[PDB]
Structure formats: C-alpha cells, structure tokens
Design a protein around this ligand. Sequence first.
Ligand SMILES: [Mg+2]
Lengths: 1338, 302, 97
Amino acid sequence: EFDAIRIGLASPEMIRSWSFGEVKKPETINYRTFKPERDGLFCAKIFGPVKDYECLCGKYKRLKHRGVICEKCGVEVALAKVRRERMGHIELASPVAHIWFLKSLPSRIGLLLDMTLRDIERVLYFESYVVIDPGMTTLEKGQLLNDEQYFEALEEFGDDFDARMGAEAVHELLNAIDLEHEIGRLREEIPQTNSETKIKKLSKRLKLMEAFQGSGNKPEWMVLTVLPVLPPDLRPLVPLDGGRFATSDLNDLYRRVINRNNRLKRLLDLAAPDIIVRNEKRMLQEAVDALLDNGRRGRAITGSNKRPLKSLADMIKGKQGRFRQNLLGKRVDYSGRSVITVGPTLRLHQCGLPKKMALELFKPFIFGKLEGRGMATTIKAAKKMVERELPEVWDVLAEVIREHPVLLNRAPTLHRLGIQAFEPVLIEGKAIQLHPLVCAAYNADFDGDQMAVHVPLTLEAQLEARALMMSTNNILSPANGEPIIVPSQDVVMGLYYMTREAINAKGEGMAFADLQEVDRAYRSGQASLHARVKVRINEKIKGEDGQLTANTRIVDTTVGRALLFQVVPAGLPFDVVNQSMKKKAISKLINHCYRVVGLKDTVIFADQLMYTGFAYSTISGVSIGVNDFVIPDEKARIINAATDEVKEIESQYASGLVTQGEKYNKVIDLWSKANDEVSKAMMANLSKEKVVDREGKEVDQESFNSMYMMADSGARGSAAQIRQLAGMRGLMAKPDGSIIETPITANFREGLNVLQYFISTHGARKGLADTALKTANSGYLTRRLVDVAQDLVVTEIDCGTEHGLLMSPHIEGGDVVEPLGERVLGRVIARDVFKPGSDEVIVPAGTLIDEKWVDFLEVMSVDEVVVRSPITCETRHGICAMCYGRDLARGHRVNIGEAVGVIAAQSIGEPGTQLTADNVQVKNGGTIRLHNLKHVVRADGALVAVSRSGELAVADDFGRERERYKLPYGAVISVKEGDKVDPGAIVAKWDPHTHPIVTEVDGTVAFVGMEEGITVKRQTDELTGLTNIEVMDPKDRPAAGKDIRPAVKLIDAAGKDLLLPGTDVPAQYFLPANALVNLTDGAKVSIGDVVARIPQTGGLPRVADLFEARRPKEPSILAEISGTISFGKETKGKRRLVITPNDGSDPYEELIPKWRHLNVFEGEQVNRGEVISDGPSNPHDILRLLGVSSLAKYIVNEIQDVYRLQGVKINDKHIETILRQMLRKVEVSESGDSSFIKGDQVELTQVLEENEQLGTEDKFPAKYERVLLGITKASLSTESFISAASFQETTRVLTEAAVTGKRDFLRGLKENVVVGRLIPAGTGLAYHSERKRQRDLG
Amino acid sequence: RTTDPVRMYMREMGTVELLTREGEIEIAKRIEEGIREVMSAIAQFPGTVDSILADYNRIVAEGGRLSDVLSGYIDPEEARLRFTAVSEQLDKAKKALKQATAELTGLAELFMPIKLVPKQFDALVARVRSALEGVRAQERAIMQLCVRDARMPRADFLRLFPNHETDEKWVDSVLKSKPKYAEAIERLRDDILRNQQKLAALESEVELTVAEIKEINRAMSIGEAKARRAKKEMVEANLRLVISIAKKYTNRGLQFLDLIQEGNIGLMKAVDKFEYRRGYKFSTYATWWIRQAITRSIADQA
Amino acid sequence: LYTNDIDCGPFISDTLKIDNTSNQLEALVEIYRMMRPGEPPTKEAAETLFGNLFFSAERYDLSAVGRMKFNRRIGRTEIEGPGVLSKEDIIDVLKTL
RNA sequence: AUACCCUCGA
Ligand SMILES: [Mg+2]
C-alpha cells in the first residue's frame, strides 16, 4: 500500500536516478532493419526489450534469467511491460529554464529573484546581460546590461564583475540565493513598510521562501540542466496500415530537442562565433519549452498542418479541457447500449434486455455455469454453444439473469437518479425495454433515446445495486422528498378519466355492496365508468401507531373512483381517492402512501396505478380531433373591437396628438388585455362545454373534451399552450426583445398567415438557440458544483453545537411564498420550541421533524423556529448527521457515509436546463405588528419612521405573521398595534418621491448660511406651485458660494440651542443641492417634520453569479459601522461620510465616488447592516458585516427565487451545503502563530487555537475573519492538489504544488477515484476506517 | 518584447553588413596570415618538423598521398626541393645547438610558406597542447602538494618558482629562506624532484626550455585567435546569404531555424575550405556547401 | 477652429494632439514598429511594408462587391472603383465614423 | 488503432 503522494521539483541527480540511459540519437528506427537504434528514442539499452524475455541478438532466449544482461547483448532480458516504467535522460549542453515556472501568471522564477518576468525574458532570449557576484563594483546583481553597456562596464572594471547571458545566467543566480539570508532580510523588512501593495508582495515573497526552505526544494532545480524522456509506449508510434508509421507529437518534440542539443555540442566544440552559439542556445530553450508546453510564447507548429503540436502539458490536461477523460472517464467493459422502448408489462424493479445484448454481456457467467453444469468441457465448446445459440444455452442464460441486477443510464446523467439498477428480463428484439414510471427520473422519452447498460460483477457490486440503486429504492427525489417515480402523461390521463363524474350516466343511482360488485357491474356493461353511485367499503385506517382499525362505510362516489380504490393499499382512507385524481393529486397520494404504509406496498401501489392507468386510458378511446379545439365565439367580436381601437389610435397618432412612444405602450397594453380576455373566454367556454340531460331539464357539467382533460388532469399540456391552440397567439417578441406592435390573431387550428408564422419563427428560433446554451451552462455549473462540494460527507452523528438558522415562512410580498412547514420538514430543531406563552417546551431538542411534527406545529401557532444547518455543525472534515436533517431520497435520517455534498451539487445543477411603491396596501385582515422599527411618535400621532431598517407586519389571530411589508424612511403610519385592520386598508401613508429628511427635534430653526444665489435660490414654480427656496448647486454657485453650504441650526421656539441625544453637536443637518425645505426658517417645526427632500438578472447566469460570489458592475454600497452618519464632501469628487458611533467613535470612513447616485441622508443612525446606496448587494460586505447566518439566508433566498420562478422545488439543505463548502476558509487578522494575512482553512485555525489554549501562552490564540470564496475558487484552493489539478488550471496548481512541495493524503472522493481506491463515502467507509485503525494506531 | 526567435536573430545579425569581393580577399588574407603565423610557430618545435619529414618519407615510400599531406603554397618535385632545403636547414641548426637561434629563425622562415592538410594540422596542435598539458599538470601537482601540505605562502610561490620548474635552485632557495614551511617541504622533496626529472626529460625530448615553449605556444594561440576572428567576420558577413538560400525548403518537414542553422554549419565548412587564389566570388562556393548541409539535414529527417 | 460643443465634437483634433509624430517618416516607422515589433526599422523597409499593406494589387484587394459596397456606404455615385484602398478612402471612412 | 474535420441523435 501507499499514501500521501508528493510533488516537488526534479533534481538533476534524481533525474539521473529515474533514467535508465542517456538518449543521444534523434532517429528512432532504421528503415532497413526494423529494430530501434542505439541511443535512440526507443533503444533497447535504455527502455527495455521489444519482445518479452528476449534480447537484441537472441543470444539468450530462455525464460530463466529475467534480470541477467548478456555480454554481447547489453540490453537486459526482461518482460516487455518494462518499456512503460523505464525513462531516459538528455544531457543538455547548456541549462534551459522550465516553461511552467516561467510563464505561470505569478512567475516563480521571477518571484524568487525579485526581478520582473520581462527582465528575465530579456536575459533568457540573449538580449541583455545580467550581473553575478557584483563584488566591489558599482554594478548590482539585479542590474541588466546591454551590449554597449556591458562593453563599457568591462572596459571600466576589467574584472570582479561576472556578467552572463541565457538560462546559464539564471541558473547561476538561482543556486546563489541563500534562502536563509533572503528569508531573514525579507522578514525584517516586511513590517517596515506600511504600504498594502508592498506588504502583500513581500508576504508572497515570504510564502515562497518558506515553502522552499521547508519543502526540501532547491531553487536551482527550476532551471533543468537535464530533462527526462517519456517511456516509448506512452509516446508510441502507431504504424498506419500499408507500412506507414504514425509518429506522436511527443516523438516529434523529443526529436527536435535532441537534434538541437546535438547541434549545440558540435558547434561549441569547434568554437563557433558567439552570435550563432547564442542563437543555438535560444533554439534549444525554445525547443524544450515547446516540448513542455505550447502556445504560451512561441506557439510552435507541426509540418504541413496548421494544427499545433500536443505537448506534455496538453497530454496531462487530458481531453475535455482539464476534466481527465482517462482517469475519471475510463471506458469500461461488460457494457452496451441500444434504443430504449416502453415496456408496459414490466414491474418497477425489472427492465427488458435483448437476447443478444444479455448473451454478450454475461458471456463469462454463461461460460462458468456451462462448465459447472458440465454441459461444456473445453471453453471452445462453450463458445461454440453460445455462438450457435443452442436451446439449452437460453436456460443457463435465464439462470444467470434471474437475480443479477444491471445498471441503466442515459447520456447526460444530471443526478444519481440518472443511473439505476434493474433486474433484467430477457426480451425478443434489439431494444432495451424500460418501465414507463422511471422515464421521468431519467428525463428520457422514447423519441430516439439510447441507454447504456452495465453489468456489476462482484457480490459487493450486485448487493449495492440491489440495496442502494435498485429502482424501487429511489422513489423519492434526492432533491426534495416529493416522489419522482410517479404516474406520467398517459397513466395520469387514464386515472383522471376513470375518476370523473357525469351528471347523468348509465348506472347512476344504485348502491353496491362492495368494490367487487362495482367491478362486476362495470365489466358486465351495466354501469358507466363515471356515474354517481353509492358503495360501501372496508377501509383500514392507520390512525394509531401499531393499530390498524378497519371500518365499513357507505360513500357517495362514482364507479371509477370505487374501482381505483380497489388498488389503494390497506392503510389509507377512501377520501384520498374520491377527487378527480389529477397529476398533482396522484403525486401527493403516492407521497402520502410512502410515509404511511411503507416502501414495498408503495412500489406495488405504483405498479398497480400504472397498470390501471394504462388499462383505462386504453378503454377510454380518448383522441385529438380538429373539433376538439373549440374556438370561442366571442373571439371574433373581441378581435374586431381591438382592431377598431388600434385603428382609432393609429389615426390619432397620424393626427400628431399621440406620440409614437406612448402609442406603442398603449397598443401593447390593449392587445395584451384583449389576448387575456380571449383566453379567459376560451377557457370558460371549453371547461364547461358540456350540456347534459338529467331525467328532463338540461344541466351543465365539467367538460369531457379531450384537450380539456389533457390540460386539467395535468397529464400533458398547459393553459399557455391551449392559448395558442384554440385562442389567439398574442404578442410576440422581436429578436431585440421588443414586443411587435401587432399580434398573431390566428391560432393553430385556424392556421397562421405567412407574416405571423415568420414572427413565431423569431420566437421559436430564439428559444431553441437559448436551449443549447442553457444546457451547456447547466453542465458547467453542475460540474463546478460537484467539484467544490465533494469532500463533504456525513461523518459524525451529533457535533454538539446549538447554533443554526432561524427559519420563518417566506412571505416576500403580500402572499406566503413558502409555508413554514415545507421549509423545516425533514430538518432538525436546534433549540427549544415554545408556545405563544413561554416556559412551555413544545419541541424539546434535536428531534427530526417529520410529517407528524409538521402537522403538530401547524396545529399550534409556531411561526419562527431555529433549525440546525450544514452552515453550522462546526465538526472537522465533514458534517454531523443531525445538522444535515432527514435524507430526501429516504424517509429516515441520513446515515454515516452519505456523500451529501455530491447529492447537493447534483440536486442544484440538474434543473439548470429548465432555466434561461408609494404606500402599503394590506392584503387580508390581521392584527398589525411592528418589527425592527425605531421611531418616536409625531405631534399628531403620525409616527414617521426615518430609520432605514424597518418593516410592517400583520400578524394573524393565532399569532403567526401572515404578511410583512418593508416600511421605508419617513413613513407616516396610523399605528394600531393590536387593532385589526380590514383588508385593503392603507395603514402607512408613506409617499417619498424624494429623500425626505426628518426633524426629530422641534423649535424655531435657524437656517444659517442660506444665500439667495450662492447657497439657496428662492425659485418659485408656475401658478405658485411651491412657496419654497431651491438650494443652489455647489458648482452652479459662485466661487465663494461653492464652499458655502446651508445649515439649519437647531434652536428652540425662543432661541435655545438643542442637540440630538448621544452627540454634543446639534442636529443641524445641512441642506444639499436639489432640496425642498418648505418650512420657513424660524418657524416651529414639529418632531419628524420633513426638512430636506432630494429626488432619487435571472436564470442560469444569476445562480452562477450567486455561486461565484461575484461583484456586479455597480455593487450596492453598504454602511460600515453603526453610528451617527455624516455628509459626504462632494467637492473632492468622492463623498466621505464619517461615522461617529455613540458607544465608541471610529473616524475611519471610506470615500464613495459620486459617479453613482447616493441616497444617503446625513444625521441618522448608520446601522452597519443597512444600505447606503441602492444596487444589487455584494455577497461579501454582507458576510463581513451582517455575519454568516445573514449571508446564508440571503444567498438561499436569492437562489430559491430563481428556482421557484420556473417552479422547480429544491430543498435548501443543498444550497446550504454548497454555502458551507464555500465558507470553508477564513482569513486571519492578528495571528500570533501564523502569517499576518493568509487564506487558511477554518479547521486549521480552529485546531491551532485549541492547541494554543492548552499550550505555551494564553494570548497565542488567533483572531480571524470569515471569507467567502466562489465555487471555482474554493475548489481550486483545497489542501489536496490532485483534486484541484483535475478540475481546472492544471498547470498553475501543479506548479504551485511543485514549488510548495505539497503532499496529498488521499482523503477525498476524487483522490480515491483517480488513484483507484474505495470511495471514502458510502460502503467504502468501513474499509477506510479499518485502514485508519491499522495505520494511525501503529 | 518580441517573442519571435527569428526576429531577434535578424536583429542581432542585422548589425553587420556585407562587403565587396576585395573585402573577402582581405579576410582570406587574414586567415592565411594567421595560419602562416601558427605554422611558423610550429617550425620552432623540432618534433613537429621531424614528423612532417616522416610524413614526407611516407609520401616517397607511398605511405601517403599528395592530396592527403600538402595543400599548395602561396607537383611533388617542388615539394622534394623544399623539404630537402628544410632538412638541410634542420641539420645545420642541430649541428651548432647563439647562432642556433638564428638557424631556427631561418627554419621558420623556410617552413613558413608551406601549407598542409588539416589532419596534420590537428596532429601538430595535439602534440603541442599535450606538451603544454604535461607542463600544466606538473604545475598543478607541485602546487597542490606544497600549498595543501607545507602551507608554504602563495606570494613566494608565484614570485620565485615560476618559469624554472626544472632545477633544484627554487627548492634550495625556499629551503634557505628558512620558514617552518620549508622545513615541512623536506618531506616532499622526493616526489617534487622526481616529477621535475620527468619535466626535464620532456624538455630534453624537445631540446627547449619552459620559457621558449611558452613563447611558441603563445604565438600559436595568437595566430589561431586571429584566424578565428577572421572566420567570425566572414561568417557574420555570409549570414545574409544563408538566410536567403534557406528560404527554399521551408515546408520540407523541418523548422526554419533548424534549416538556417544547418546552412550556417555548411557555410563555416565552406569558409574552412575557401581560398582567394581561385579568383572567384564567395557566394558561388558557399551555395554548394549550404545546399549540401540543408539537403542532408532534410534527408536525414525522412 | 470652427467647431461646436453639443454637436461637431473635436474627436480628430483631440486624437491629433498625441503620438508626437510630425514627419511622415516618423509615422511610417511607428507603423513599422507596431506591425513588425522588435526588428529595427529602416526608411526603405518601413515604406515598402506600409505600401504593400496599403495599396498593392497583391497582398490586398477589394472585389467588385467590396468596392461597390464601400462606395455605397461611404457615399459615392460610382459603383465600380479601384481594387485597392484609395488615398482619400480612409479620409472618407474617418469622416463617416 | 492516433489527431483533426464534417454530418447526425438524445
Ligand atoms: Mg427525446
């Protein structure tokens, strides 16, 4: 065994140790005799023998001496496999710099010499000298000299100045670094300079120097004086048929390097002139650079082809970018594929398998069984029987297939559900038969899809297939507890048609003694499928745990509902099946049955539902005909009216009265209203388009029109599509996004004109083009999500912490978006839950909330609860099994070893393909309550609230808040806390239209410095619209009026100076430009009076932005520290708003440029959490100021809005898991034990602080600040280098690991995947634990 | 910050300019002057002259060919007369080994116009540099011995010892200087003296002293440096020709720089085998060698 | 300097206030430095390179469609024109821009 | 039995 794969620089001595010879000849194989030549790229002396256990001459052919090397044949006789491990070396006449440590964005060789990459490139390209060992001379070691400059320096000095050129000079510089002295000097000079940029550069210098010192790495090794050569089979020449040979790019590059090296030696040995020698050295540097990588500087090309050569960097990068196609993809055996086909006679656990595919896949199993039964003696006979397809081979094939599950997956597997185990059944054909109910999970229709089939071999593999990924096990979606193996289109249609009702039908009225009599009457044809009848039933209810009570009851229902209830298992009431059985109702029924009865009865119920749905959709000859699309009669009248209106509006525009810009909006609004009215009329006609006779007088009933059934049942189609099918198509958008001024009046039944078809083509082309980019972005996003959240696996059971996130129902707006029940279902409680009256414990502790608990919480008036979240659970290297709540694919709590991180990433990324103001008006009646409001009462009781943080809530009678609204600054509210307000009332009468400035104090104000023409302007509007004064702009004012700002000095009614609480200075708010101060100076202004009034995306890109924690073009400016805010000096061009908190004055405040509008009013509480200027928030400021839980709530809500817009439901556990993975790193402020500023894992800092507490001193513990990293940045910054190297930027991370000397302990999922070990999660957890037991404990 | 290597090759080479054919004649005259100087230096080494007499004896005994020994002057019968004269000069110089110095100067004058095949040139160079290597090795041996054992100071080392290396005068003088280091030297008298006996044997083989051999080898080195400088000037002149001719074979399955470097090697070979008395332009002869080099390079890569 | 503020801005005049290029040789050598960086430029070499890139029947050509469309877009009655860019063609494109 | 290019399906 082994562990902890290391990475470091290759020493010339260790490079020699690796090699088995010195490659010296460029050519590979002689054209006359086809054996590799001496000292060539395939020489037998170096790389090994061509034929296993053979030599060059054949002197020794026996298989006995496997290590002896013959006398005439120096090529040691050994196995042919050895050509894969044996490498050689090339001795270069001069050293050449390594391309990776040169051209990486932070140049390691440049950083180690404190000289810019440009200067090093000048030296390497033989353009300028560099100075080595300055000695006692004016020249410095870092000084570069030109030809004339160097000649002058040599003439002036003569000696004591070693100046060189090329990579030889760089090598001479590197080995004279004296890393100890440089580290000491740079550490001494690190705190001397207070510049942030310089301190950052010297900190990076320190990091590199300490990495080199600790890692046992030598700086001179960066410039390789000797380079290896790949073993011949890893750079093979695959002979083309016809005697041609196909040479790999590696062979071409190696040949080029060898040729240039041989040229170098034989031109230095004859003392060629300096210019040509330096040109040859440059060529050798370029050739080695092209061998190592390409396109960085030179972009070398091949012969007679514009395609660049493939270097080793591109080889290790793999295909598909950096996603290793050989170490992660790894085409497998015992596999096949074919087109899929629906099999309606299949049970949920089994799938059809063609005879030939099954016979080919299970061939070794068939051979084994044939030999065991003795029917075949030699394997040749077994092959003859299996190829003859003798009748007895089908019996043994059936025996090997009986209990051997197989794996089926679609091409894009967006989640674990995309590959499930099926117990194959032999079928006659070439297509793979699929169960209809698993198509939804696979997202696989039968329009040409193909599926790959894989045969697990080991008993471990078969048991994992049967116990974890058998199709019956995964009924519920891992993304949300809602079922995924649910009736789809056709079976939903059948079940819906069965459970309908007709006003008058054959067989209506009589009573049936049992469901059996109902079936007997229906099959005999004496009763309609949907006829209102009476039937008594024997339902067994599971109301009490462990006690199944059966009761007999007579229910008024239909024949179809009674028939379908005969399928329902024995734990559910009949009332669950007495409705119309729409798709959502059926899905909820399956979900309820799973959580009540079990799993086996649930799969039986699902199979029975599918069978009956198919049977009764076949019995009902439902069909689509031209008469089914019922065009409403009023559509013609509505269209004519709208055409008359648009003609009138066009005439008005021609008159010039109406502007084109307003006419566009008017006509689009008119046409949208007409389209909505037409659609409403069509739906109202279609839905009730049934007139029936009930023993005389005619009556109406729900329609039996086929298209209406297909919509209402939810089987297939939507109202938006019937809007096109039977109503006007409505407005359509031009490619620029502007809605075309004329709509499509015709529907698909009437047929569109040519122009309308062309517009619909605009729309359809836009959508179809968007689809492919949506798929690509979703794939990239889910790949990044998986690679950032893979190491997270449940390890502990209960971490022990009591921190979590306060979860409350999402009530953004007037309606409840998500009830509290759905948010905390399957979660775990973090603290006590209390009644409306305290001291009464409802939910004690971390009890996993289930259906019973959510019903209990709904019965009580619990509104806000705190639950344990993965962002909590401070356990190290994993997550506790509580803080990650109930598993979603299973009904119970998660089990140790569940890779919830990968499940989270798959859950978030799977539905990506589905992606792309004055006053408050209370909705319903409820007791109004205030939250986070800080305002004093007005003179008359207006209660104007100037605080920016504040909201208005209308709590229900029970106590839960039914609706909440954001109350803005300066809002007058008729405070009636505890007094119920009727629905539609306007309790708060805010009307900002401006930035009002409240006046918390009263008295006769003293507007000091109000200059009419310099600071203010008594400009009155027309018709005496305002008796006020307009403040003069700072630049529009005079030279002296530019610096003068109006100030309303705080005085009382008699002239007494007043000041705001907390600060001695008065609340004399300045009046800036564009102000509205109506109150006369010296007039008593009431408390809260308005003094100064100043007038003021979505889809996959948005969720990607949130998961990368990006900064938009204009981020929202937020307050830094809570306290007394000030005014920003606009003269300097950037507003500086100093903050003076009452608890402690901190004068530090940044300057915000006035390029973006700032809506901040001075003289109020800063409220660090609050916002200073509008705009989309920058995830960071929220994290570093509001906290972690606040950032968690904001990010979760932001992602969930995007997902809920398309109606896809995803549990928040997954988003919180990804958030935990991103917040995994923290930066340190005052270390005492580490570097000043460093990005270290929070686990590392926590461990260091815990050890320091019980250690040398007590102050050794470090203080740190949490930092947020994007997924593409958090994934590349992992401690393991193998995980990052196979994600992205392989070169950068590999060079960083090389210089840093990183070690990778294979303790993640991808590490064990690439190295071929058992996964540290799932069933490999036991193996990993035993390995840890045997390793750590001796 | 151009990254194109061809571009910087053009920049660095573009400083030098061409020259008319009289300039080529002058450069070839410089080459001839250097080789004449080094050959005249070789004349002051009796072993080399005896070796050229032996090669002539092989010529007469048909052990060597006319084209494998001589390369003209500034038919074998003129060679007969010239080597008879040089042998008579050698014998008259050896007879009176004062006036012997004048006799060797006349010997160098007579052997000065002669020109020989490069193989014999490298043989003569190998002999003289081997004598130099022996002297230098004795220097290093004595130096490491005394410095690392007796701690005898480097100042008196580089003051009194040099240029004799053969007589007991320096050992005795250091012994009479009476430091403790001279007392420690007495343990190392035997090895140093027997190595100096070998040096004296080498000198008696060559009949010359250390200072004389140093003078001749220094003059030969100066002549070689002059010839090397002339060749450098000439090849830097013809770099333009080599790039111009290298244009023909770009897409021949080989890089441009490899082609021009092989053509450069060919043109240095051409310079090594170019004479001005042919009365021809250089380009005519350089084209053949450059074509040979480039074509062979491309043929090797098939 | 006949100009205005709201319309007719100094877009060219402001551009001409830079690059410190007075002689046509200075402009030619600057263009040679830009297009062929590194190699030291000579008068003849830079002039030849600029001429070849600008108005040579080889290494540059507008087809009949190209000339017709350029004339139509910049504004010209003649449909047919020279195959190479005219001296005043660049001035016309600058004016249109 | 290696790399590009083209076309096609989900
Ligand atoms: Mg499909």
